[PDB]
Design a binder for this molecule. Structure first.
Ligand code: MMC
Ligand code: MMC
Ligand code: MMC
Ligand code: MMC
Ligand code: MMC
Ligand code: MMC
Ligand code: MMC
Ligand code: MMC
Ligand code: MMC
Ligand code: MMC
Ligand SMILES: [Cl-]
Ligand SMILES: [Cl-]
Ligand SMILES: [Cl-]
Ligand SMILES: [Cl-]
Ligand SMILES: [Cl-]
Ligand SMILES: [Cl-]
Ligand SMILES: [Cl-]
Ligand SMILES: [Cl-]
Ligand SMILES: [Cl-]
Ligand SMILES: [Cl-]
Ligand SMILES: [Cl-]
Ligand SMILES: [Cl-]
Ligand SMILES: [Cl-]
Ligand SMILES: [Cl-]
Lengths: 343, 338, 341
């Protein structure tokens, strides 16, 4: 192997430690487990596939926020197992079933695919509370994963755009604040966006300065009806929750900006958020029914702070607890029901 | 993995999972067939062709997890186009890529002077992720044609210029975001009885997402393609955005710029509303960049959070449906014409 | 040296003039100054780094708008110096401290990084008034200006880029660009357009701005992170920068939708009267004090709308009439001393 090439069966750790850039064998099958990257390196995957066994992650990446060079991973497929067991309860042990675990990340992940991870396919965390460590995840595919992307507290200002999710329970497990998530396509996932207190994958910085990012031009279809196979019921560290397409429950956090999103048979649960704010579902397409499929529900206590502006939709779409004066133009069927949203 | 000019592409694709072209070289291909996933690193090469297209036929395997991927490759379909020739079934073959049952990624490629659709995607049967990003389309009759049941694709950050129709839309649920189009007659077309519906037909159509796009100089100040356009069974008069299908819903439409970029909302499924949200609507003088809705459906259309000038005409949408006021509101039941 | 490879220490000018596509040595360190590209060429940077010295640009690119092939630069890091001197007054001298100076560009810049440029990291100009431009997935850090597009450099796309610790991200003259999905933090100004700018180029301040500005984030511009000064020297006067600064009676504002402004002040000083402007679908968070103020000139206030925006009580909206703000967001205020140029 000339310098820069990493063959199947060779030691990845040694290759990464000795090279600033590494090229994999085009279309080859690798088998990696707990590989450790301690310095910036670029990996050109060249259409290769990385399988694994046992307890993940496939790669541990120890970031150096001081170093101007980023870790970059392009054009690589990661396989976490065979098609998932969706009925297994989630637990601390399964949080290890990751493709990438990055701490203090300065990373670019572009054109990669992630199949059948029992935890988060990608997990980013910060070793200490503070965003000069820029994170970019674009043009990736996620299929069969429990969680797509988990960003811990103080992993901030990342960009996750133009990704495609299908058959995942939770696409974005959101803790760290200020991310832009734009132009992502999701279908047959229980939940595109989850934020609450007491989450998995908060990391060492904890649930700090959370969410309040940007969520634009995304599609979240068939969350609760007409495609998704993952259960609604989901085990957090201290309690069970009932997932929705968009789930937000944290009295100490603000919601992201929410504009240009399509929700066909979604459901959205705005359970709790910081009272010194408003929230607008802006420029959305809201399609649902018949029955309670693709419901948007807000806590009555906060309903007056929620608006639905410039949205299109059908009569079958239910909007729950938002005052009629707050919905311009009329869209869907407006309803009052203080039992909704349930946590 | 290297494929040289003059070698057989079919053999190279059938024998390799990944193929690298000679950087900057000129290839000459015609009716190449790909039957298994393969990645092509184009490396700035150019592919010319002759006769009847496509340049490449791609027979997809939806069962197979690997995608076909094509990067950094320029496709040339001919010399600068004959814009006055009537469109016909024969010209539908003048394609760069024809993909069936696609699981495909097309990134950083350029498509010049195709007499049909530069890219055509179809499904062999009614119900495979599709990504088309950072591509350039210039001089093509049609940019991207997605047939019925080719759904949930992403076409973003592409640039279209001097094309008659950028997106020939049949298949549903695509995201089309951040595309820049100038001097094209039509950015988006959906109707019944289209070209390139493919085997699944006009099924579960449109109702996708159309955000942050720019469609400029469609009917004035740049475009050279004719308005009049031949579908299989009738002639239509194109607009920057043309929608006529009583059995389909419109996409979400937010953050788009329309400078001299006419829109015709002729017909759509009555159990829906439509909003032109967060747009910039600039037009006039005269009837340039008109937004027109059928009077029968006008009450279901809203123009919300849009900016624009006095010269921009908005036709048949009720005044109560336009917040804030933008342009010059007008009633005219002869608009929009098919 | 096989065809298409350019090694450190070899002449870049000769390599570019002899090849249509060039591959750099993966992860190698190059040192270039005033390299000249006269014909389309693609550069695969392969994670290499380019340092420089003296007066920039690192690369001069003389475009041929007649030629269908683009210049393409991928996966390359450009270093303009050590961490910047933010208190130095800006002057004509420093405008040369660029990574890329392109004239009559047909160019794609993808996956590149730009560190510590004393001028514009990227400057695009047109040699004559009336060529597709794409700048995506790039990082800009410590630069005075990120991207400067001169007059008649139009219809470019700048999307999915990340800016931090820059004074001005986009120095906007040329019209009709789409700027979408960009993330900026700790920069004094994300968008600047006015008369009498730096980097107007040979075509001047012609057919300016009026593009598209969507899904961007501009955070901590005037508070809580940014270290660059507000006060900024243009050729003929000093201005006081804001996160979004627009002052040109002869130009229209871009479409403005889906943007987040946390401590991200906006000054709409002057713009063409035959238009309206809408802050659509935004998140507007500010306070306490005058941090993240949105201010419009009282003369033009009636033409400005704030539609479908969310925010907090601390966010100040100045001079926009109450009837123009739907739904209510922030604290509405009248003050004709704002915005100051
Ligand atoms: C971070 Hg292992
Ligand atoms: C970190 Hg602003
Ligand atoms: C995808 Hg919900
Ligand atoms: C089928 Hg939406
Ligand atoms: C599908 Hg050829
Ligand atoms: C391009 Hg209309
Ligand atoms: C030129 Hg708008
Ligand atoms: C173009 Hg120097
Ligand atoms: C970044 Hg203001
Ligand atoms: C702190 Hg935003
Ligand atoms: Cl660790
Ligand atoms: Cl679905
Ligand atoms: Cl967020
Ligand atoms: Cl191979
Ligand atoms: Cl065929
Ligand atoms: Cl034009
Ligand atoms: Cl659509
Ligand atoms: Cl009004
Ligand atoms: Cl070469
Ligand atoms: Cl020059
Ligand atoms: Cl976008
Ligand atoms: Cl602009
Ligand atoms: Cl938007
Ligand atoms: Cl004034």
């Amino acid at each position: 192997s000339p310098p820069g090439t990493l063959l199947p069966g060779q030691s990845p750790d040694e290759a990464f430690a000795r090279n600033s850039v590494v090229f994999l064998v085009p279309g080859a099958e690798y088998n990696w487990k707990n590989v450790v990257i301690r310095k910036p390196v670029w990996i050109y995957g060249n259409g290769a596939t990385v399988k694994t066994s046992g307890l993940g992650p496939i790669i541990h990446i120890m970031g150096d926020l001081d170093n101007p060079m980023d870790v970059r991973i392009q054009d690589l497929t990661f396989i976490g197992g065979d098609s998932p067991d969706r009925l297994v309860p989630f637990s601390a042990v399964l949080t290890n079933q990751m493709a990438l675990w990055c701490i203090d990340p300065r990373i670019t992940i572009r054109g990669c695919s992630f199949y059948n991870f029992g935890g988060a396919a990608i997990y980013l965390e910060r070793s200490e509370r503070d965003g000069r460590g820029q994170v970019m995840i674009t043009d990736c595919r996620f299929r069969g994963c429990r969680i797509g992307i988990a960003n811990g507290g103080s992993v901030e200002y990342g960009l996750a755009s133009q990704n495609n999710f299908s058959d995942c329970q939770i696409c974005f497990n959101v803790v760290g604040g200020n991310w832009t998530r734009s132009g992502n396509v999701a279908s047959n996932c229980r939940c595109m966006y989850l934020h609450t207190q007491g989450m998995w994958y908060e990391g060492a910085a904890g649930n700090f300065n959370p969410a309040h990012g940007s969520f634009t031009s995304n599609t979240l279809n068939h969350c609760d009806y007409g495609g998704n196979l993952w259960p609604t019921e989901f085990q957090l560290p201290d309690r069970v929750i009932n997932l929705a397409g968009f789930y937000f429950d944290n009295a100490a956090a603000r919601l992201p900006n929410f504009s240009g999103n399509s929700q066909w048979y979604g459901d959205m649960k705005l359970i709790n958020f910081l009272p010194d704010s408003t929230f607008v579902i802006n420029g959305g397409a809201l399609y649902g029914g018949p029955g309670d499929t693709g419901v948007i529900a807000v806590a009555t206590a906060l309903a007056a702070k929620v608006f639905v502006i410039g949205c299109q939709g059908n009569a079958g779409q239910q909007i729950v607890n938002v005052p009629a004066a707050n919905i311009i133009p009329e869209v869907g069927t407006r309803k009052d029901d203080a039992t909704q949203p349930a946590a």
